[PDB]
């Protein structure tokens, strides 16, 4: 008689799951395992959630529920409550002696509230509150400690800091559950506690869907996708170094990316980090990818450090997502919220096809290539529009499949509020024609995602306002009618904003310490230039 | 002076210079000095073979380089010996010169630096064998190359690596190369007083010569635009710090050489190519200054398509050097197309002497080609991307002349012109028929390329001066001018500045076609000197 609980919030996986393991630690003393998930209305980024990420979270629970079953032939499952947690955990500690509560660390400041709650309840009830660090690569408190009590605000720094520290920890053992106990619960208690019998739908949490590809959630599609990119990169690794001739940014590639699986924990990063690191494990690959050296996997590792970069940066700053109250975001003076502009930016009716391609794929699918996160974000902010970033942030945070709080704001702040990196204000990295013309030359993407534009020939599709009236007749696209005339004059805004940025840039000659590109080179790579 | 009679029999060591023109990381020198206690004096000798120090096929520019390069060491010596010791320059025959001098004084050792290039095995052995005869030690030390090429070749199982990739793999088993040797002690060394009659009979120079003494003439097919270089290990050493500094900046600076790390052709005289070519500068020293500067730091940036960390972006360039020399040691047909097991045999079209004689002159009508052949003639040195366009102009990239032609023109007028290095590059660039990318106009055409390397006509006007007046629009592709613009800018195609010699469009298609036409036959490529991959190609031009 006893029971330990693995309580998922982001772990969402069975491997390199250290708290999944601490909870099996006492299998021998007949100690039962309770797989718990709780929809407390905020957890797992379900406070501000669109329909697509919400489908994904249930896939991933669908997965772990299955997994748990078919390893103990229908014995234990995953229990999903819709509830308050500090309150659910109490009742269930009244129904069965509750030994340890096991959790993966959720460093983002916001979970510091919720988590506190039970941290306490355990104190209050004398329950071992188990917290294993495994969502991040390191223990962000060492990074912040090592760098002298404050998280590095620059990529160069962070790197230099985790190079003082060791390499990262390694994926903890595969979890053993074939031989393990399972809490059976008085069915009144289940009904009474709101425990689902049938895993819910978006519809149940009042989330509805208003799509040319899409994403399967969970640890499983996750490990699949890891081996598919692991191969293709061995294939490169092997074939001398090279990656063609096609390690330049293709936007119309598969549902390839593991970004939202990392965001929900479906895939350990320490797995990802090390399955790469191994694969290369020395061998001296003289050759780069995105301007980044590529020997030692240094090119695809780095990406996982970027994720670590922001997460870590955000640990003690709960204003991380806002502008004021936030000491590491420059106070740039964005203009007045223009709900008719904004509504244009969200709907993808701006008249700039690529942005409209990119904004519409976002809604329909919930995921967008790194280069496209750029163009749409710098378009909204400092690429003029010149509208503040907290607006592309609350939008992205809703309709993205990954949309990690720290990460999302991080990239947003970095990209739009670094007034000192002058390369960023160059329309050579801003303008979404001379770049759509590049990223998707035949208008194949644009036409996938902005269909009012099927019939426009490849001469016009990047810039259809060039079309003659007769041509607009002949191709079904009448600007102002079918496709919205440009919502702004870039020439005029581009300059408008530069001058505006210059202004501010000097009105303080010594920048304050903010979150920033580390140098122009790091801008080139962070943009694919 | 007195009983100098004793010292004659008492002994002497020769340190015989040919390449390795330097007093540092010159172990063959330290070798001679190894008997300072025995009372053995040093004899620093250089000799005008007829060949040796690449003098067989020389022009004014390199010849002069080789001399101030010698004036250097000569002073270098007196400098450290209050005029006591001096360098001795005989124009004569090695084996014979040495034999004589031996009677003048006992020789315990004759010390030289190695010379793997097969051309010298004849000259060298001559002495290897003379020492055997007079019971003199023939001392021979490897420097000039990074490694011992025989050990390089030994590892690749007896054949020399034919591909850059294959090369580093090989030298990666064999560890890092030897470190530079200690600085030399000449301050407290003895020297030799020769009988002045003997000095005369052996043609030993009193005053260091002019190129003209060797019937070498500072015309250079009629030329002198300029901004030139000087030889000497001092000069070399000067230039290594000068570049070194910069690198450290890029090193300290968050990696990257900033956006002017793309090739600038109107940069200065900076290149140490001609100094490592004459040993004026130790390659071992170049590599470990770089490798030291970068020791332990991870900086992820490329340059280059080559990583930057651990100096491996600059370190590699001396490995490129290593790659050709070492690949030539045992193949004395290296400079030739036939009898060369490693140069694919390729049906180059008959010599068109009018074509050649215009390629060498810079009268093609395609400026940057003209710009560069004329830089060659004028100055003696050419940027890499430049050597390329002109080599691919002559051979495969329009014109279809054998690479053997370009080679011997290049060996007449290059300040470096290593032998192995030159021919290798020439074959490697012109004869690699299975790398299709080299065929594409996108590295072939000199017009699209002049537009990228020399944007505003700067260079092309510096060197193709008949075109100072064409604007910038028409400067690059000046055949576009109306009859009156030509009247106007005082350059009328034909008169004034050559009408093109070939039809690139027509010729490039032709050439590619034949390269396919060759590629099919012979389905499976015969092992040859070729790039590792298409990515190597990319880094080897700048692209
Ligand atoms: C305005 C803006 C908002 C963004 N919001 C998010 C977000 O909410 N969540 C998110 O994870 N990424 C976000 N990104 C960053 C990035 O575009 C994605 O991580 C990337 O598209 C994921 O696909 P990938 O797996 O092919 O990339 P890869 O290049 O394959 O790298 C693998 C993983 O590295 C990590 N990574 C790569 N780039 C970054 C980066 N710049 N910052 C942090 N981690 C990185 C991600 O986990 C990524 O999945 C945003 C970028 C911008 C400019
Ligand atoms: C047709 C042709 C002929 C050439 N002939 C010669 C020659 O006779 N001698 C010569 O030294 N270089 C030769 N090169 C190679 C190269 O162009 C020069 O080494 C380079 O221009 C030297 O300038 P650098 O010192 O700035 O280059 P760096 O990039 O500073 O490298 C330093 C040194 O590395 C060596 N190195 C660099 N590239 C190469 C290369 N491709 N092959 C071999 N060694 C290399 C040279 O010693 C060079 O000085 C030739 C190139 C071509 C295309």
Swiss-Prot record, chain A:
Changing residue 408 to A: Accelerates decay of the FAD radical. This is Cryptochrome-1. Keywords: Biological rhythms, Chromophore, Cytoplasm, FAD, Flavoprotein, Nucleotide-binding, Nucleus, Photoreceptor protein, Receptor, Repressor, Sensory transduction, Transcription, Transcription regulation. Blue light-dependent regulator that is the input of the circadian feedback loop. Has no photolyase activity for cyclobutane pyrimidine dimers or 6-4 photoproducts. Regulation of expression by light suggests a role in photoreception for locomotor activity rhythms. Functions, together with per, as a transcriptional repressor required for the oscillation of peripheral circadian clocks and for the correct specification of clock cells. Genes directly activated by the transcription factors Clock (Clk) and cycle (cyc) are repressed by cry. It is found in: Cytoplasm; Cytoplasm, Perinuclear region; Nucleus. GO terms for biological process: blue light signaling pathway; cellular response to light stimulus; circadian behavior; circadian regulation of gene expression; circadian rhythm; detection of light stimulus involved in magnetoreception; entrainment of circadian clock; entrainment of circadian clock by photoperiod. Interacts with tim and per; promoted by light conditions. Interaction with tim irreversibly commits tim to proteasomal degradation. Interacts with l(1)G0136/CG8198. It comes from Drosophila melanogaster (Fruit fly). Belongs to the DNA photolyase class-1 family. Unstable upon light exposure. Light induces the degradation of cry, likely due to conformational change in the photoreceptor leading to targeting to the proteasome. The keyword Ligase does not apply. InterPro entries: Crypto/Photolyase_FAD-like_sf, Crypto/Photolyase_N_sf, Cryptochr/Photolyase_FAD-bd, Cryptochrome/DNA_photolyase_1, DNA_photolyase_N, Rossmann-like_a/b/a_fold. One of its GO terms (molecular function) is DNA binding. Changing residue 518 to A: Slows down the decay of the FAD radical. Its main location: cytoplasm. Residues 2-137 form the Photolyase/cryptochrome alpha/beta domain. Disruption phenotype: Flies exhibit poor synchronization to light-dark cycles and show no response to brief light pulses. Mutant abolishes rhythmic tim and per expression in photoreceptor and glial cells, but not within certain pacemaker neurons of adult brain.
Swiss-Prot record, chain B:
One of its GO terms (biological process) is cellular response to light stimulus. Induction: Expression is regulated by light and circadian rhythms. Under circadian regulation, expression is influenced by the clock pacemaker genes period, timeless, Clock and cycle. The keyword Endoplasmic reticulum does not apply. InterPro entries: Crypto/Photolyase_FAD-like_sf, Crypto/Photolyase_N_sf, Cryptochr/Photolyase_FAD-bd, Cryptochrome/DNA_photolyase_1, DNA_photolyase_N, Rossmann-like_a/b/a_fold. Changing residue 529 to A: Accelerates formation and decay of the FAD radical. Residues 11-146 form the Photolyase/cryptochrome alpha/beta domain. The keyword Nucleus applies. FAD-binding region regulates cry stability, cry-tim interaction, and circadian photosensitivity. This is Cryptochrome-1. It comes from Drosophila melanogaster.
């Amino acid at each position: 008689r006893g029971a330990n609980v693995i309580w998922f919030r982001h772990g969402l996986r069975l491997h390199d799951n250290p708290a999944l393991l601490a909870a099996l630690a006492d299998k021998d003393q007949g100690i039962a395992l309770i797989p718990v998930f709780i929809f407390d209305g905020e957890s797992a980024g379900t406070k501000n959630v669109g329909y697509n990420r919400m489908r994904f979270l249930l896939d991933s629970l669908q997965d772990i529920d299955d997994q748990l079953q078919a390893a103990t032939d229908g014995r234990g499952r995953l229990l999903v409550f819709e509830g308050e947690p500090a309150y659910i955990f109490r009742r269930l500690h009244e129904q069965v002696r509750l030994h340890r509560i096991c959790i993966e660390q959720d460093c983002e400041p916001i979970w510091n509230e919720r988590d506190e709650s039970i941290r306490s309840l355990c104190r209050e009830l004398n329950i071992d509150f188990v917290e294993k660090v495994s969502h991040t690569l390191w223990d962000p408190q060492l990074v912040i400690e090592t760098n002298g009590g404050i998280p590095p605000l620059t990529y160069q720094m962070f790197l230099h800091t985790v190079q003082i520290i060791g390499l990262p920890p390694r994926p903890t053992a595969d979890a053993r559950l074939e031989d393990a106990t399972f809490v059976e619960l008085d069915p009144e208690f289940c009904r009474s506690l709101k425990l689902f019998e049938q895993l819910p739908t978006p519809e149940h949490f009042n989330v509805y869907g208003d799509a040319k590809i899409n994403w399967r959630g969970g640890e499983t599609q996750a490990l699949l996708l890891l081996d598919e990119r692991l191969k293709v990169e061995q294939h490169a690794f092997e074939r001398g170094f090279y990656l063609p001739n096609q390690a330049l940014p293709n936007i119309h590639d598969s549902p390839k990316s593991m970004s939202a699986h990392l965001r929900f924990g479906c895939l350990s990063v320490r797995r990802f980090y090390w399955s790469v690191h191994d694969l290369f494990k020395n061998v001296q690959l003289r050759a780069c990818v995105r301007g980044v050296q590529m020997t030692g996997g240094a090119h695809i590792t780095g990406q996982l450090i970027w994720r670590e970069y922001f997460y870590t940066m955000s640990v003690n700053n709960p204003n991380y997502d806002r502008m004021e109250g936030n000491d590491i975001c420059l106070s740039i003076p964005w203009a007045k919220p223009n709900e008719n502009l904004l509504q244009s930016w969200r709907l993808g009716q701006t008249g700039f096809p690529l942005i409209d391609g990119a904004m519409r794929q976002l809604l329909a699918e919930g995921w967008l290539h790194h280069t496209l996160r750029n163009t749409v974000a710098t378009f909204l902010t400092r690429g003029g529009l010149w509208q503040s970033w907290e607006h592309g942030l609350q939008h992205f945070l809703k309709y993205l499949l990954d949309a990690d709080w720290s990460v999302c704001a991080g990239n947003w702040m970095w990209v739009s509020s670094s007034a000192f990196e002058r390369l960023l204000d160059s329309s050579l990295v801003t303008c979404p024609v001379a770049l759509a013309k590049r990223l998707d030359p035949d208008g194949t993407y644009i036409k996938q995602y902005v269909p009012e534009l099927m019939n426009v020939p490849k001469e016009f599709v990047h810039e259809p306002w060039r079309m003659s009236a007769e041509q607009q007749e002949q191709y079904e696209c009448l600007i102002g009618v079918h496709y919205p005339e440009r919502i702004i004059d870039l020439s005029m805004a581009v300059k408008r904003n530069m001058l505006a940025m210059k202004s501010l840039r000097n009105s303080l000659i010594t920048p304050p310490p903010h979150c920033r590109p580390s140098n122009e080179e790091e801008v080139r790579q962070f943009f694919w230039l």
